């Protein structure tokens, strides 16, 4: 028939003629696939057709319906156990491809026939069915239950476990894999057949076939989280197994076992159960962190696997260094002596990795050895071999903190110079490594960098030429980080001349939709703040563009909201980025921003940003609010009545940084808002006191909450003072740590004003207030008067002897400062 015309198109596909039949077959799909499965089911000639069909399914299945679809299915399900291993393989790949495209609802007959065929006497049908059943379980994020199976998991689970005893290795694996796909769901049928699973796994532990061993490891790894109570009685005898499983040849099992320590570590039980094993485990982990023929691929596009035994082992080490801290060192230091100085480089660098790996965890116990080691790493920076350079960068950044705490000549100066050299290194993986490492250094070595800005700017600005996409993104990070870590020092005509010009090309080059703006504008926002008024020439185009991004993504979001099908949602990261720059413009331009704000529709925009579903959007616009409130309250005031109800419904601790910026804005609002703030206080005050008192909020939020309450008090003590008796305790506890800035002075004026309206609400906890006033080292000559009268008020009220009685719970400086400075 016309099948003979098809049998020529397939037998021609099997270098120029290829692309000719390939576009001839993929196009004949309009007229089709009834011939495709016909050829397969009634060798390499007909195995190809089944795979051609497979690619028709994958590319256009909705154009299929019941005529062919049902014949395809019925045809290959009868051939699921064909004894020609290539055909069975073709059918199996097909079965599973149909079954992930057309969901499970469209083929309900499937799974129950597969679960049935596992009991075939013919091995080929058993192995075929079990194979596809594994592929379906696994390639299904949603699990599998009695609905789709046509058996209770109460019958199906023990039946899998039964096959753990099948002679054929191929099946036992299929078996373990299937059962494995039920450990996460913590499904009941398995939880009840649990001791059977365990006992069964243990039996399969010493298998020969590598796949079974991987599946057993992968199992024991999972069970560790889900069901720790059963494994614990066998822990030590099963640790030693996993320990042999890492050294195990066949890396795919070695890796699958290595995960054990990653997850085991994250368990409370770990520290006490594992101590005895560290002598044997640590060496094994360090040996895994070395390299192999990875080099061959890594030197000659230069990329290997995203996750592998080296990373796993390293990650294992990182975590283990955090669980045990210094007690880990006696297990590593000796081995680290043997590695760090070594003729064979592939060995030396693994030691360098180890060194960085354990940085965070062992830092304290690692301070002694640093004066020896830091300079050693600094000479390694200029090693002959690239892979030995890149990682000493990283390892050095891991110690950036200490380096900065020592005299800036000994370590900082040599490190910084060698880094700026490495940043411009010949190969990419060193640039990236060294550039990232330098950004970590900036963060730590703050103004200590001002001596070198000229050279630092020379380097970075030069890389803009050298670097390409990948590494360019990290350069933005490093440039922005500089601006942050140095601030205004950067604002000098000489510097703006190097730095800005390239940043603007990138700006004019990139179109509005280009996701490349993210790292640029988060860079430019840090520049814009650091240069201050220095930015003026550049601000008018920068400002207008951000508002348009914000307008646009809002507009786009509205459309999508009205009609999700006809219009698409926008990438909100675009405004999260735009907002954050306007914010940093508002901060560095202060007053000079007003006209731009006045003319623009920024405040109308911000009001929908604050109402946005996404925290990050909200978070950015609140920070922007506070910034504008400080900069040009002239324009913000005319709608404090609209913002406050939002700010109030946003004082929610579960979104910690949205809440943090809210609290901050409110505080800054009041300063500008004077007495007028009073009708708004009820909106915010109660939940504000909730946050100051609810436990386990980060200090960063508490401190801002404390500042804000004070400031709200200062300006409106009548409405804020009633509550006083409830927040003073955590309030002082928090603001006792802060240095005597203006933030603090504003906050303490708040309570001092609130005390002399409601002194009754402070006596019960007057200790905290006294610690808090012994926090001050230099108060304004009128604030110490506010402390004076308030403390004397407590001395005259309580009395000479009854006040002497009170000071007995005071460390001497606190008492001596509260007596000499205030006269009490």
């Amino acid at each position: 028939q016309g099948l003979q015309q098809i049998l020529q198109l397939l037998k021609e596909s099997q270098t120029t003629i290829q692309r000719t039949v390939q576009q001839k077959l993929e196009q004949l799909n309009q007229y089709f696939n009834n011939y495709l499965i016909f050829v397969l089911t009634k060798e390499p000639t007909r195995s190809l057709s089944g795979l051609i069909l497979k690619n028709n399914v994958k590319a256009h299945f909705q154009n299929f319906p019941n005529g062919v679809t049902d014949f395809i299915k019925s045809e290959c399900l009868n051939n699921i156990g064909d004894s020609s291993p290539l055909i069975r393989a073709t059918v199996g790949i097909l079965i599973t491809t149909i079954a992930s495209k057309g969901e499970l609802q469209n083929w309900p007959d499937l799974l129950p026939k597969l679960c049935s065929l596992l009991d075939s006497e013919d091995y080929n049908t058993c192995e075929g069915a079990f194979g596809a059943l594994q592929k379906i379980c696994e390639d299904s994020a949603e699990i599998l239950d009695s609905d789709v199976l046509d058996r209770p998991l109460n019958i199906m689970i023990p039946k899998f476990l039964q096959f753990f005893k099948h002679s054929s290795p191929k099946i036992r694996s299929h078996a373990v894999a299937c059962v494995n796909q039920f450990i996460i769901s913590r499904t009941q049928a398995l939880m009840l057949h649990i001791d059977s699973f365990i006992e069964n796994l243990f039996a399969l532990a010493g298998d020969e076939e590598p796949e079974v061993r991987k599946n057993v490891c992968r199992a024991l790894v999972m069970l560790l989280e889900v069901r720790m109570d059963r494994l614990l009685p066998h822990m030590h005898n099963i640790v030693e197994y996993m320990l042999q499983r890492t050294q195990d040849q066949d890396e795919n099992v070695a890796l699958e076992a290595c995960e054990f320590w990653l997850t085991l570590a994250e368990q409370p039980i770990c520290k006490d159960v594992l101590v005895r094993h560290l002598p044997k485990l640590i060496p094994v982990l360090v040996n895994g962190m070395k390299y192999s023929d990875i080099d061959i691929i890594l030197l000659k596009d230069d990329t290997i696997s995203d996750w592998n035994l080296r990373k796993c082992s390293a990650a294992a080490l990182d975590v283990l260094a955090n669980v045990y801290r210094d007690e880990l060192l006696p297990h590593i230091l000796p081995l680290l002596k043997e590695l760090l100085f070594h003729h064979e480089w592939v060995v030396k660098e693994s030691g360098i990795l180890v060194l960085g790996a354990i940085a965070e965890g062992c830092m304290q116990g690692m301070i002694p050895y640093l004066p020896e080691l830091i300079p050693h790493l600094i000479q390694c920076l200029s090693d002959k071999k690239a892979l030995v350079r890149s990682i000493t960068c990283w390892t050095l950044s891991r110690y950036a903190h200490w380096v900065v705490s020592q005299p800036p000549d000994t370590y900082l100066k040599p490190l910084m110079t060698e880094l700026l050299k490495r940043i411009l290194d010949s190969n990419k993986r060193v640039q990236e490594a060294a550039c990232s490492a330098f950004a970590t250094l900036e963060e730590e070595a703050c103004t200590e960098l001002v001596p070198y800005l000229a050279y630092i700017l020379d380097t970075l600005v030069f890389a803009f030429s050298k670097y390409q996409h990948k590494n360019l993104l990290i350069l933005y990070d490093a440039i922005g980080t500089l601006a942050d870590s140095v601030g205004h020092h950067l604002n000098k005509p000489e510097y703006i001349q190097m730095l800005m010009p390239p940043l603007i090309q990138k700006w004019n080059m990139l179109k509005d939709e280009d996701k490349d703006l993210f790292p640029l504008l988060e860079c430019l926002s840090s520049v814009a703040t650091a240069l201050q008024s220095g930015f003026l020439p550049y601000c008018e185009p920068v400002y207008q563009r951000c508002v348009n991004l914000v307008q646009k993504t809002l507009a786009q979001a509205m459309l999508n909201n009205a009609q999700p099908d006809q219009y698409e949602a926008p990438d909100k990261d675009f405004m999260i980025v735009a907002l954050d720059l306007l914010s940093g413009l508002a901060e560095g331009l202060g007053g000079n921003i007003e006209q731009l704000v006045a003319r623009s529709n920024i405040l109308t925009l911000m009001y929908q940003c604050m109402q946005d579903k996404m925290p990050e959007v909200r978070q950015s616009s609140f920070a922007l609010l506070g910034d504008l409130t400080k900069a040009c309250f002239q324009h913000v005031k005319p709608c404090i009545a609209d913002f406050m109800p939002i700010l109030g419904t946003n004082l929610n601790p579960e979104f910690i940084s949205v809440c943090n910026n809210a609290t901050w804005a409110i505080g800054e609002i009041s300063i500008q808002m004077g007495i007028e703030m009073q009708p708004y206080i009820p909106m915010v005050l109660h939940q504000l006191v909730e946050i100051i008192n609810r436990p386990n909020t980060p200090k960063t939020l508490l401190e801002n909450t404390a500042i804000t309450i004070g400031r709200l008090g200062y300006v409106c003590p009548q409405e804020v003072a009633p509550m006083l008796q409830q927040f003073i305790r955590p309030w002082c506890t928090s603001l006792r740590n802060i240095r005597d800035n203006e933030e603090k002075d504003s906050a303490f004026r708040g309570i001092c004003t609130m005390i002399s309206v409601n002194p009754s609400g402070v006596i019960q906890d007057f200790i905290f207030f006294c610690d808090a006033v012994a926090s001050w080292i230099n108060p304004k000559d009128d604030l110490r008067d506010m402390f004076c009268k308030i403390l004397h008020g407590f001395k005259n009220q309580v009395g000479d002897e009854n006040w002497r009685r009170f000071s007995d719970q005071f460390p001497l400086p606190l008492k001596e400062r509260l007596a000499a400075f205030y006269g009490v």
């Binding site: 490492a437 993210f518 988060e522 999260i576 980025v577």
Partner: peptide, 17 residues
């Protein structure tokens, strides 16, 4: 005390999990 989009710094052992 106000308070991102990136963190593409170099790591030897980042887990794609």
């Amino acid at each position: 005390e106000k308070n991102k989009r990136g963190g593409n710094r170099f790591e030897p052992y980042a887990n794609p999990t």
